[PDB]
Design a protein around this ligand. Structure first.
Ligand SMILES: CC(=O)N[C@H]1[C@H](O[C@@H]2[C@@H](O)[C@H](O)O[C@H](CO)[C@@H]2O)O[C@H](CO)[C@@H](O[C@@H]2O[C@H](CO)[C@H](O)[C@H](O)[C@H]2O)[C@@H]1O
Ligand SMILES: [Ca+2]
Ligand code: NA
Ligand code: NA
Length: 242
């Protein structure tokens, strides 16, 4: 099987590979708002074969932990990520996902979420597709997998995967297919399937929710007493398909 990229996070270093992995930065949205004033690698380390991403509160200030790949991947590929949460955190918002590189403004270039967790459904994860066709100017939910295992322990290791081709996206958990999002071969102007127009990166983060500009976010209310939380990523792999 053809390995286009792999990181086992087992390099003789205390931070993830500095050529591949960049620290996440502040932006006025739910997942990014608490990268503000995160000092370098304070919430991000490599240790005992894991990337360890921490979310915590530091003298009044919520701080996220996350990195994104500077490298990205074409179509005809499958991304596999092994990860667990150390615990459930109320208001915690950990994610394993992909953004297009150099695409028009979100959500026009698309977005793929291999894993998200929120306190509102604590014994499940979400696998989600975003496009301008789905979301338009006003939508943020995307299309998510409704038959998601309802009886599932996020604090154990799982392998989250998406296979991306011109035909479709196929999601997996622990090597079992969960759902697919098909190319409908519509007018290019509808932007229904942008997933081969730009390379997609890898994003790994443990973010905190609560209010954004006075509106409650999907991950809901932050319970300070539950903090800190960590996501441990054992490995990331991108395979070239047949
Ligand atoms: C509604 C929203 O917050 N959208 C931002 C998007 O969010 C992701 C969600 O769509 C989804 O729930 O999965 C992940 C993991 O939890 C994120 O929460 O993220 C993108 C990429 O960061 C944002 O696009 C960026 O917006 C900023 C300004 O806010 C900037 O314009 C940048 O150019 C753009 O890429 C969505 O706003
Ligand atoms: Ca590892
Ligand atoms: Na790095
Ligand atoms: Na999701």
């Amino acid at each position: 099987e053809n390995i286009l990229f792999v990181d086992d996070f087992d390099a003789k270093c205390i931070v993830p590979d500095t050529a591949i992995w960049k620290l996440c930065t502040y932006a006025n949205n739910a997942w990014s708002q608490y990268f503000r004033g995160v000092d370098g690698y304070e919430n991000v380390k490599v240790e005992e074969g894991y990337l360890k991403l921490r979310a915590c509160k530091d003298n009044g200030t919520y701080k996220n932990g996350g990195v994104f790949s500077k490298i990205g991947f074409p179509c005809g590929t499958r991304l596999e990520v092994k990860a667990r949460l150390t615990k459930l955190v109320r208001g915690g918002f950990p994610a394993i996902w992909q953004m297009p590189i150099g695409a028009p403004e979100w959500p026009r270039g698309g977005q793929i979420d291999l894993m998200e967790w929120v306190q509102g459904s604590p014994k499940q994860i979400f696998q989600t597709v975003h496009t301008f066709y789905i979301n338009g100017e006003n939508g943020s939910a995307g299309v998510t997998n409704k038959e998601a295992d309802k009886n599932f322990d996020v604090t154990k290791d799982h392998v989250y995967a998406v296979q991306r081709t011109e035909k479709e996206l196929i999601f997996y958990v622990d090597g079992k297919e969960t759902w697919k999002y098909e190319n409908q071969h519509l007018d290019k102007e509808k932007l229904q399937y942008p997933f081969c127009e730009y390379p997609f990166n890898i994003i790994l983060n443990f973010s905190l929710g609560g209010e954004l500009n006075g509106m409650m976010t999907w991950p809901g209310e932050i319970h300070d007493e539950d903090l800190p939380g960590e996501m441990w990523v054992d490995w990331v792999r991108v395979v070239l398909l047949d």
